Design a protein around this motif. Structure first.
Motif, PDB file in Angstrom:
ATOM      1  N   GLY A 466       0.822  -1.200   0.000  1.00 34.86           N
ATOM      2  CA  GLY A 466       0.000   0.000   0.000  1.00 34.86           C
ATOM      3  C   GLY A 466       0.855   1.248   0.000  1.00 34.86           C
ATOM      4  O   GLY A 466       1.896   1.303  -0.660  1.00 34.86           O
TER       5      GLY A 466
ATOM      6  N   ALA B  64      14.867   1.774 -15.659  1.00 36.24           N
ATOM      7  CA  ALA B  64      14.812   0.312 -15.661  1.00 36.24           C
ATOM      8  C   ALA B  64      15.992  -0.295 -14.906  1.00 36.24           C
ATOM      9  O   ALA B  64      16.776  -1.068 -15.454  1.00 36.24           O
ATOM     10  N   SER B  65      16.128   0.062 -13.626  1.00 43.11           N
ATOM     11  CA  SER B  65      17.220  -0.457 -12.812  1.00 43.11           C
ATOM     12  C   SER B  65      16.804  -0.766 -11.378  1.00 43.11           C
ATOM     13  O   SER B  65      17.676  -1.068 -10.552  1.00 43.11           O
ATOM     14  N   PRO B  73       3.828  -3.724  -5.569  1.00 45.95           N
ATOM     15  CA  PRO B  73       2.873  -3.293  -4.535  1.00 45.95           C
ATOM     16  C   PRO B  73       2.620  -1.797  -4.536  1.00 45.95           C
ATOM     17  O   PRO B  73       1.496  -1.377  -4.234  1.00 45.95           O
ATOM     18  N   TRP B  74       3.624  -0.982  -4.862  1.00 46.41           N
ATOM     19  CA  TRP B  74       3.430   0.458  -4.957  1.00 46.41           C
ATOM     20  C   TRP B  74       2.572   0.850  -6.153  1.00 46.41           C
ATOM     21  O   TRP B  74       1.837   1.838  -6.074  1.00 46.41           O
ATOM     22  N   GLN B 100       5.701  -1.402 -22.701  1.00 44.48           N
ATOM     23  CA  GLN B 100       7.133  -1.549 -22.930  1.00 44.48           C
ATOM     24  C   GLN B 100       7.808  -2.240 -21.752  1.00 44.48           C
ATOM     25  O   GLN B 100       8.600  -3.172 -21.942  1.00 44.48           O
ATOM     26  N   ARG B 103       7.649  -5.930 -21.563  1.00 38.80           N
ATOM     27  CA  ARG B 103       8.497  -6.433 -22.634  1.00 38.80           C
ATOM     28  C   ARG B 103       9.973  -6.261 -22.310  1.00 38.80           C
ATOM     29  O   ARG B 103      10.779  -7.128 -22.667  1.00 38.80           O
ATOM     30  N   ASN B 104      10.341  -5.175 -21.624  1.00 39.78           N
ATOM     31  CA  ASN B 104      11.718  -5.022 -21.174  1.00 39.78           C
ATOM     32  C   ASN B 104      12.132  -6.140 -20.228  1.00 39.78           C
ATOM     33  O   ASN B 104      13.301  -6.543 -20.237  1.00 39.78           O
ATOM     34  N   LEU B 107      14.163  -9.020 -21.532  1.00 46.38           N
ATOM     35  CA  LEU B 107      15.609  -8.924 -21.678  1.00 46.38           C
ATOM     36  C   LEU B 107      16.323  -8.749 -20.343  1.00 46.38           C
ATOM     37  O   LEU B 107      17.429  -9.272 -20.162  1.00 46.38           O
ATOM     38  N   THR B 108      15.717  -8.022 -19.401  1.00 47.47           N
ATOM     39  CA  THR B 108      16.351  -7.826 -18.101  1.00 47.47           C
ATOM     40  C   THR B 108      16.393  -9.111 -17.286  1.00 47.47           C
ATOM     41  O   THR B 108      17.355  -9.334 -16.543  1.00 47.47           O
ATOM     42  N   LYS B 110      15.420 -13.522 -17.114  1.00 47.41           N
ATOM     43  CA  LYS B 110      15.107 -14.766 -17.808  1.00 47.41           C
ATOM     44  C   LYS B 110      14.699 -15.904 -16.884  1.00 47.41           C
ATOM     45  O   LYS B 110      14.045 -16.843 -17.353  1.00 47.41           O
ATOM     46  N   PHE B 125      -4.507  -3.954 -14.677  1.00 46.39           N
ATOM     47  CA  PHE B 125      -5.874  -4.446 -14.535  1.00 46.39           C
ATOM     48  C   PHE B 125      -6.181  -4.904 -13.114  1.00 46.39           C
ATOM     49  O   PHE B 125      -7.331  -4.796 -12.672  1.00 46.39           O
ATOM     50  N   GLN B 148     -10.223   2.602 -21.247  1.00 40.78           N
ATOM     51  CA  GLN B 148      -9.744   1.234 -21.096  1.00 40.78           C
ATOM     52  C   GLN B 148      -9.936   0.392 -22.349  1.00 40.78           C
ATOM     53  O   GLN B 148      -9.359  -0.698 -22.436  1.00 40.78           O
ATOM     54  N   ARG B 157      -3.842  -5.607 -22.922  1.00 47.79           N
ATOM     55  CA  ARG B 157      -4.658  -6.736 -22.485  1.00 47.79           C
ATOM     56  C   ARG B 157      -4.342  -7.991 -23.289  1.00 47.79           C
ATOM     57  O   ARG B 157      -4.253  -9.095 -22.729  1.00 47.79           O
ATOM     58  N   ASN B 161      -2.900 -11.565 -21.813  1.00 51.58           N
ATOM     59  CA  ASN B 161      -3.407 -12.897 -22.142  1.00 51.58           C
ATOM     60  C   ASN B 161      -2.334 -13.756 -22.804  1.00 51.58           C
ATOM     61  O   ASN B 161      -2.249 -14.965 -22.537  1.00 51.58           O
ATOM     62  N   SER B 180       7.990 -12.588 -29.243  1.00 51.58           N
ATOM     63  CA  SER B 180       7.712 -12.291 -30.644  1.00 51.58           C
ATOM     64  C   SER B 180       7.281 -13.529 -31.417  1.00 51.58           C
ATOM     65  O   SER B 180       6.491 -13.411 -32.359  1.00 51.58           O
TER      66      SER B 180
ATOM     67  N   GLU C 218      21.199 -10.125 -25.704  1.00 51.45           N
ATOM     68  CA  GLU C 218      20.108  -9.573 -24.898  1.00 51.45           C
ATOM     69  C   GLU C 218      20.273  -8.072 -24.674  1.00 51.45           C
ATOM     70  O   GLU C 218      19.973  -7.552 -23.597  1.00 51.45           O
ATOM     71  N   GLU C 264      23.627  -4.630 -16.659  1.00 47.17           N
ATOM     72  CA  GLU C 264      22.736  -3.474 -16.600  1.00 47.17           C
ATOM     73  C   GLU C 264      23.351  -2.262 -17.286  1.00 47.17           C
ATOM     74  O   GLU C 264      22.653  -1.526 -17.992  1.00 47.17           O
ATOM     75  N   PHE C 267      23.284  -2.803 -21.085  1.00 44.78           N
ATOM     76  CA  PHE C 267      21.910  -2.694 -21.557  1.00 44.78           C
ATOM     77  C   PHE C 267      21.397  -1.260 -21.552  1.00 44.78           C
ATOM     78  O   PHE C 267      20.742  -0.838 -22.512  1.00 44.78           O
ATOM     79  N   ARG C 293      27.323   3.053 -12.075  1.00 44.49           N
ATOM     80  CA  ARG C 293      27.562   2.788 -10.664  1.00 44.49           C
ATOM     81  C   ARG C 293      29.047   2.935 -10.358  1.00 44.49           C
ATOM     82  O   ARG C 293      29.876   2.284 -11.006  1.00 44.49           O
TER      83      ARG C 293
END
Lengths: 560, 336, 369
Positions: A466, B64-65, B73-74, B100, B103-104, B107-108, B110, B125, B148, B157, B161, B180, C218, C264, C267, C293
């Motif tokens: 939250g 993206a780090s 949760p946030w 995006q 989808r990122n 790669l980040t 696996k 959702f 939506q 959406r 799925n 892909s 990747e 990282e 990338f 970093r």
């Protein structure tokens, strides 16, 4: 092949073979000079054919042979009646099979739907009451649902009944319910929780938006429906306008009312209030708003109608939108809301006015915060249900959202949480005090009576979700710093938090006592690895392949 | 904290009024805890100023780090519900970035992919809809579906799925593909790929019964027709590009599929299609198959013997340097 | 190609100290055009040959490159067709090729580690194998005509079945497909058509080589490369986007030995480069600033002396400041302080003298009222 068709998952291979065989049979039958024999053979052949489009084709060919025999029967023979009574029986079978195929195609094989095939209007009415219609608007993850519009339209086409009359009846059924007692003003305030509104919107989805928007506009303005002579109550207008808000966008709504969207929203508020008053028979009409500029009429309404809870709510919700913030008026408003025990509504009103400096000094403001925070806590008790824990989190948020929370008795709220067996929630309220010495005394007296591992587990399970995630780490920092200062490393040493207690020694640079405890009271390996990690963190790495005693010696020489 | 306390910083922070700048700085620092705390302490401050551009700035300061364990949760309870309640018009870009972002995660990550990808994609959702708190005045509190059902949200959406079915394939059907790959195939091609992942001919029917037939009966698919189409595709992917006649991988895989057939009509014509695609003369295993299929009786065995003499005249023509199949009518005298 | 790490920290605990890991480190990377000194040389040379063809189609003047081999293009095409015809029948000739390979120094290990990521693909079709022989020994316009005429004869006679790859952007693959469907029309070779048919093969070869690295390591996805490999633009802009992709390759390779430890960082740099060229043209003068970093690159500035070290003491606003800075080089772009003349001075095993340049930025505050 027909028997195999009833069990095969797919039919792409059997369809062509069955088509060739049926074409051979049809060619044999169409070369018969006698059409009576052809009809008598085709009807017998079609009866053994199972349900599907093949049954429909067989019945159609039986109808064609019956037509051919009828053409060969002059109107002066008794075979005319025998042919016609059989032709209408074949028509009954055709209308049954066409409906059955549509029902099966949409995965509707219930016995009740199959029984109601002689009443196509009733079957269509039952189709539009499907729970999937409500599920489509409730959940937005559409991947596979039965299409009621595609089923009912085809059923009506097969049964040769117009869908316009059925849709007209359905519009009257839900959008304009009769005056029967099932209505409460709470449901009128939240009409999205009604299954009838979802069905009305779903029905309006199929027809073009241009006509549906105008029809809903006429319902929301006129006193008579576009479907008949029935009177339009304000609840019907509210439901129709909320359907318009769901289907039509801003431009379509503004093109009809010739008003800005804010004026349409104000009209929606007014008609919702009028519907709620009409349900309880309160003689407040639409003419009470279109005159007498808002300050005077709001003050007069508060003067005359300060005894009704919903009148108090009407004044409160009008003052929030029309921006009238008299101090005494709000002092009365906030007090009367708690006079009717609307604790969550009072919390919402307080959080809505928690951004205005003038209302922060209302004499009832801090008084309103205290009772709203405590009443859900006092009503709650162990064990904690998810609703009660959510209410405790709401009370803590109200502590956070209150700008004058320092004027509230946080020791009392913390003790109430203690009665709820929530040391983490109690420490959260204890930490937010503006007095430093009392806070330090209370925290030291509290954390010495509660197990730190349980507090940290409660922080991880509930406090990290939250809006409380950012404050849980600070409570955790306070707890771990107190643990380090109290030489209480042994409490978390047997648990998973000790390594975490390690890394907090990294960030706060409070590693001296932890290193001493590990080197003296515990194994030297954990102290050596701890010092190696500390050296790696500070940019002065200790070279590897070093004995733990030597690493401890350089660490001790590094503290001087 | 108290160890970073200083008068120069204290006065500067006190004079600061745009609470979003500190949150953006913390997001650029990778410090999600401090950004969340600054978001919490100023919830009602920028609430009256919430619009699209500041949300775009929030998404751009987002990098993206960071770990998703403190972020999901946030998003579920704080960010996405606030966007839905305040500005539904921002539900597009917030979705698009997420479209995006998940989808990122291809790669980040696996190991947890696509489970972490699925749980990040569904967070839009699965976010709580503000419908219980009582305030009908600010009519934007209800997240209307006019935003939506847009193209971006519909694609998101569909991606959610697709991730659900991808996890189903990874765990149950043991058919591991790229995102892909799954975005451009259908059920028949998925059936073909489940055999493609299998290299040993002995395990083709066992896995067919184990998962492939289960997937078949779950979507009203045909068994023998799809097996024949798989044989045809295996012939096409090898013989059409066959520069060297050593790609015998199709013969071994096709014999097992032939053994999987239950309709006699679909066995002889499948062997004929093998005949009509294989280069004359065929290999040893194909020669064994031809001699086997000559032995039993069927009305199409006459067609099989027609194809056999067709193979013979193809052998003659390609031994005399004429490699075209079925010269029409005029070159017969020239060939003679 | 200047790759410099700027490290900022506050407060200053010691004069000329080792920066801690609480500092903010940003790598400023400028990458020049071309890379003949790295592992991409045999790519760039081919790209340079592509740069000829992409220009030869535009103006018609073909500035041919020097032949890197002994044989001519037509002989290579003839023997390549002969070997494939032997493979299809009367043949399948087998060759044995053993060659001596060796290392030069320990940096050759990292050089080879980078090389294998841009190694020739294990799966090669007819078109790319033809281009490989046609990217180094084509010196005249008649060679293209002769080679395409030989290909036409081979396709018409039905002697070979060329190996093909998906995408088939080159028209030659379509010609092979129509030869699979019987006999095709006689292909004419006039004007810049022979140049363009060969150009259409190199684009696909380079695109496949790029995709085998971006997705293979990747570092990028198909969507990330979709804007650059999109066939909706004309062929010249396709070559321009190939140039941008090669510049991104040069950016990445120039930084692989430094930030290889963290995936990282590699990338994020790749994504920043992709996003830059999505909305901007090819720019070599632009300096990409990647925040990195300090923990991962702490071993790189603990073994290097700083080119400039600066301490800035200020109060409140930075309008009034006192700066003390030390630079091993001259920090002045309009003056040059006298270094000793290294003529007839130390020319032996002794090290050369170095004069460090210290500059003090002071000021004077005047109150305007």
């Amino acid at each position: 092949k027909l028997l195999k068709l009833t069990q095969a998952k797919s039919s792409t291979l059997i369809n062509k073979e069955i088509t060739k065989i049926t074409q051979t049979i049809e060619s044999c039958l169409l070369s018969i000079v006698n059409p009576e024999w052809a009809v008598a053979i085709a009807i017998s052949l079609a009866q053994d054919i199972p349900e599907g489009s093949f049954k429909i084709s067989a019945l159609k060919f039986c109808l064609y042979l019956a037509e051919r025999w009828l053409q060969n029967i002059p109107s002066q023979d008794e075979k005319r009646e025998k042919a016609e009574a059989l032709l209408k029986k074949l028509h009954i079978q055709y209308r049954r099979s066409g409906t059955e195929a549509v029902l099966i195609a949409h995965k509707l094989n219930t016995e009740e739907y199959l029984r109601v095939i002689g009443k196509p209007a009733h079957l269509i009415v039952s189709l539009y009451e499907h729970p999937s219609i409500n599920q489509r608007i409730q959940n937005s993850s559409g991947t596979d649902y039965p299409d009621i519009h595609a089923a009912a339209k085809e059923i009506a086409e097969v049964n040769e009944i117009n869908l316009e009359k059925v849709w007209d009846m359905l519009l009257e059924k839900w959008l304009c319910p009769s005056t029967k007692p099932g209505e409460k003003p709470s449901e009128l305030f939240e009409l999205q929780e009604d299954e009838a509104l979802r069905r009305v919107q779903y029905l309006l989805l199929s027809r073009p938006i241009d006509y549906s928007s105008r029809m809903l506009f006429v319902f929301a303005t006129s006193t008579t429906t576009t479907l008949g002579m029935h009177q339009l109550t304000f609840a019907h207008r509210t439901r129709a306008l909320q359907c318009l808000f769901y289907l039509a966008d801003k431009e379509t709504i503004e093109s009809l009312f010739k008003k800005p969207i804010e004026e349409v929203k104000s009209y929606l508020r007014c008609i919702t209030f009028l519907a709620s008053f009409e349900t309880l028979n309160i003689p407040i009409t639409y003419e009470l708003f279109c005159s007498s500029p808002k300050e005077g009429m709001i003050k007069g309404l508060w003067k005359n109608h300060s005894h009704e809870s919903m009148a108090v709510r009407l004044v409160t919700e009008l003052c929030l939108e029309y921006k009238i913030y008299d101090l005494q008026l709000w002092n009365g408003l906030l007090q009367k809301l708690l006079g009717f025990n609307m604790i969550p509504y009072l919390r919402k009103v307080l959080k809505a006015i928690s951004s205005i400096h003038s209302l922060w000094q209302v004499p009832y403001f801090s008084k309103a915060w205290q009772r709203v925070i405590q009443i859900p806590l006092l009503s709650a008790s162990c064990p904690l249900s998810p609703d009660q824990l959510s209410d405790c989190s709401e009370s803590l948020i109200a502590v956070l959202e209150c700008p004058v929370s320092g004027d509230l008795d946080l020791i009392g709220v913390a003790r109430q949480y203690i009665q709820l067996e929530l040391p983490a929630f109690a420490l959260a309220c204890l930490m937010l005090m503006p007095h430093s010495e009392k806070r330090h005394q209370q925290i030291k007296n509290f954390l010495g009576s509660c197990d730190p591992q349980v507090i940290l587990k409660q922080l991880e399970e509930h406090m990290n979700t939250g809006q409380l995630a950012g404050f849980s780490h600070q409570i955790r920092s306070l707890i771990l710093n107190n643990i380090i200062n109290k030489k209480e490393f042994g409490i978390l040493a047997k648990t998973k938090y000790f390594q975490m207690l390690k890394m907090h020694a990294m960030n706060t640079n409070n590693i001296t006592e932890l290193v001493n405890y590990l080197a003296n009271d515990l194994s030297l390996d954990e102290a050596s690895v701890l010092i190696t990690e500390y050296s790696k963190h500070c940019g002065k790495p200790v070279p590897p392949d070093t004995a733990p005693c030597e690493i401890l010696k350089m660490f001790l020489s590094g503290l001087s | 904290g108290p160890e970073k306390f200083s008068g120069s910083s204290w006065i500067e922070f006190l004079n600061n009024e745009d609470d979003l700048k500190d949150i953006f700085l913390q997001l650029k620092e990778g410090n999600l805890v401090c950004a969340q705390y600054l978001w919490l302490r100023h919830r009602a401050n920028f609430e009256s100023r919430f619009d699209v551009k500041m949300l775009e700035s929030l998404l751009n300061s987002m990098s993206a780090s960071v770990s998703l364990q403190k972020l999901c949760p946030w998003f579920k309870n704080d960010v996405i519900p606030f966007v839905r309640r305040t500005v539904p018009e921002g539900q597009i870009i917030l979705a698009k970035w997420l479209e995006q972002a998940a989808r990122n995660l291809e790669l980040t990550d696996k190991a947890n992919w696509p489970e972490n990808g699925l749980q990040l994609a569904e967070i839009f959702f699965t976010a709580e809809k503000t419908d219980e708190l009582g305030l009908a005045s600010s009519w934007h509190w209800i997240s209307l579906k006019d935003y939506q059902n847009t193209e971006e949200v519909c694609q998101l959406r569909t991606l959610v799925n697709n991730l659900r079915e991808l996890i189903t394939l990874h765990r149950k059907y043991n058919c591991k593909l790229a995102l892909s790959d799954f975005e451009k195939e259908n059920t028949t091609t998925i059936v073909f790929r489940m055999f493609d992942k299998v290299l040993a001919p002995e395990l083709i029917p066992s896995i067919l019964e184990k998962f492939i037939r289960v997937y078949m009966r779950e979507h009203d698919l045909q068994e023998e027709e799809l097996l024949l189409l798989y044989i045809e595709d295996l012939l096409n992917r090898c013989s059409s590009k066959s520069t060297s006649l050593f790609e015998t991988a199709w013969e071994a895989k096709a014999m097992a599929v032939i053994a999987c057939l239950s309709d006699t009509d679909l066995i002889f014509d499948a062997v004929l299609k093998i005949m009509y695609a294989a280069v004359v003369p065929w290999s040893a295993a194909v020669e064994q198959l031809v001699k086997q299929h000559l032995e039993m009786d069927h009305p199409k065995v006459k067609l099989l013997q027609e194809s056999y003499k067709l193979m013979e005249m193809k052998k003659l023509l390609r031994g005399y340097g004429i490699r075209e199949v079925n010269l029409l009518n005029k070159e017969i005298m020239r060939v003679v | 190609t200047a790759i410099a790490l700027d490290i900022s920290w506050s407060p200053v605990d010691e004069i000329l100290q080792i920066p801690p890991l609480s500092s903010t480190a940003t790598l400023n990377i400028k990458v020049e055009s071309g890379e003949p000194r790295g592992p991409l040389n045999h790519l760039y040379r081919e790209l340079k040959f592509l740069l000829v063809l992409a220009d030869g189609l535009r103006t018609g003047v073909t500035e041919w490159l020097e032949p890197l081999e002994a044989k001519s293009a037509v002989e290579l095409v003839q023997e390549f067709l002969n070997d494939l015809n032997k493979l299809d029948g009367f043949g399948d000739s087998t060759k044995k090729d053993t060659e001596v390979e060796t290392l030069k120094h320990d940096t050759a290990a990292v050089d080879r580690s980078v090389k294998r990521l841009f190694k020739v693909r294990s799966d090669l079709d007819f078109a790319e194998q033809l281009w490989c022989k046609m990217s180094s020994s084509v010196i005249s316009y008649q060679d293209l005509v002769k080679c395409f005429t030989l290909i036409i004869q081979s396709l018409q006679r039905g002697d070979i079945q060329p190996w093909l790859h998906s995408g088939s952007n080159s028209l030659l693959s379509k010609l092979i497909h129509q030869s699979y469907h019987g006999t095709m029309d006689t292909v004419s070779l006039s004007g810049t058509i022979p140049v363009q048919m060969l150009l259409e093969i190199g684009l696909d070869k380079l695109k496949k080589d790029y995709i085998s690295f971006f997705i293979g390591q990747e570092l990028a996805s198909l969507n990330h490369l979709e804007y650059f490999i999109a066939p909706s633009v004309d062929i010249q802009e396709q070559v321009y986007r190939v140039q941008k992709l090669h510049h991104i390759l040069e950016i990445l390779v120039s930084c692989m030995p430094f930030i290889k430890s963290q995936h990282e960082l590699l990338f994020s740099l790749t994504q920043i480069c992709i996003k830059y060229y999505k909305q901007n043209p090819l720019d070599e003068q632009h300096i990409f600033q990647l925040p990195v970093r300090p923990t991962a690159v702490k071993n790189l500035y603990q073994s290097e002396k700083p080119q400039k070290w600066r301490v800035e003491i200020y109060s409140g606003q930075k309008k009034i400041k006192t700066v003390w800075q030390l630079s091993d080089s001259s920090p002045i772009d309009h003056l040059n302080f006298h270094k000793p003349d290294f003529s007839e001075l130390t020319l032996n095993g002794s090290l050369e003298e170095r004069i460090f340049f210290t500059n003090m930025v002071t000021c004077s505050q005047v109150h305007f009222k």
